[PDB]
Write an enzyme that holds these catalytic residues in place. Structure first.
Site, mmCIF file in Angstrom:
data_model
loop_
_atom_site.group_PDB
_atom_site.id
_atom_site.type_symbol
_atom_site.label_atom_id
_atom_site.label_comp_id
_atom_site.label_asym_id
_atom_site.label_seq_id
_atom_site.Cartn_x
_atom_site.Cartn_y
_atom_site.Cartn_z
ATOM 1 C CE1 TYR D 92 11.220 4.568 13.527
ATOM 2 C CE2 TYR D 92 11.447 2.166 13.674
ATOM 3 C CZ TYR D 92 11.476 3.289 14.017
ATOM 4 O OH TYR D 92 11.851 3.380 15.488
ATOM 5 C CG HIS D 93 4.592 3.375 9.743
ATOM 6 N ND1 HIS D 93 4.852 2.635 8.676
ATOM 7 C CD2 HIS D 93 3.823 4.328 9.133
ATOM 8 C CE1 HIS D 93 4.723 3.079 7.441
ATOM 9 N NE2 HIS D 93 4.127 4.194 7.779
#
Lengths: 92, 91, 93, 93
Positions: D92-93
């Site tokens: 998750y960026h």
């Protein structure tokens, strides 16, 4: 809500053996424990441990997990307000 | 098995308040034990001990179960999902 | 399918303390347990008891029941091929 | 809870057979710890440790939950009637 009285599994087992006609001595022989340990158990003086839970379930049925859960549930009730966590920092 | 309702008020009283006025004076411990089992079990198969003589009902009271306290006296409850409802002490 | 490897909660706590940058000694002081016991715990050499579980959830969260159950599950797993029930009669009527 | 299915074949492999070839090596224990935690909780609130940063997902993944493995990495699962489905290991960026 929660159950008002929570019994030590040993005392429950004691009341169950009586309704069965199985004496502490006979039960000890069957589950492969010393009568001394079993009598301390039926009095609610030693804990029902994992090693016992396997033996006991082999004799009285249900799962070892169930008997262990009884002990835990009782243990944590007996510990309510006995431990000062005032006190301990909750990592954030 | 989290206990969600009582049909029998003598049971509700023993369970919540530890009061024995609504159940046979002799069966108090026995009944408290069985309630402690129902409360502690996570599956229905965990109540299938010999002395309990667990068995389902027909039903009419379908999804209802009973366990034996002594003689002809049973504790019954309806089982939806993982929960126990309408606990009763009959027969 | 059941989980293949079940860790001793103490050792899981060890790995969590490492990731938070907290030493054994500092963790011991916070939950109010002696480092001697805390070091035996994190090596998985002593059990996580009800008393410790209450202290531990006070720091790491979850409920005491949870930590206790990790311990229970581990114990039963460790004892699974150590106890001969061969052996024991399942009472009928 | 009942872990009923995996989206991530490497998790399924670590969970069921204890084989580590399908997950990033630094996360092997970190991941097994998390699966043990999910496997052990009886409620969802028992996963609400601070380091897990438990939070529900929204959108087309409603009824999904995620917890943190490490910076930028999550384990997710769908929550159906006390069961966990579609267990996953994602970034998750």
């Amino acid at each position: 809500m929660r159950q008002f009285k929570v019994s030590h599994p040993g005392e429950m087992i004691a009341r169950d053996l009586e309704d069965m006609g199985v004496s502490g001595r006979r039960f000890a022989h069957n589950i492969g424990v010393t009568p001394a340990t079993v009598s301390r158990l039926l009095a609610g003086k030693t804990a029902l441990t994992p090693s016992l839970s396997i033996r006991i379930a082999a004799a009285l049925g249900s799962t070892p997990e169930f008997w262990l859960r009884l002990q835990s549930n009782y243990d944590l009730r007996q510990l309510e307000n006995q431990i000062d966590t005032s006190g301990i920092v909750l990592y954030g | 098995m989290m206990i969600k309702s009582f049909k029998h008020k003598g049971l509700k009283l023993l369970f919540e308040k530890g009061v024995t006025s609504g159940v046979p004076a002799q069966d108090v411990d026995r009944i408290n034990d069985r309630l402690q089992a129902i409360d502690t079990a996570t599956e229905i198969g965990e109540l299938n001990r010999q002395i309990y003589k667990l068995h389902p009902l027909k039903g009419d009271r379908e999804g209802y179960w009973s366990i034996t306290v002594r003689a002809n006296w049973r504790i019954t409850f309806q089982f939806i999902n993982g929960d126990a409802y309408i606990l009763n002490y009959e027969d």
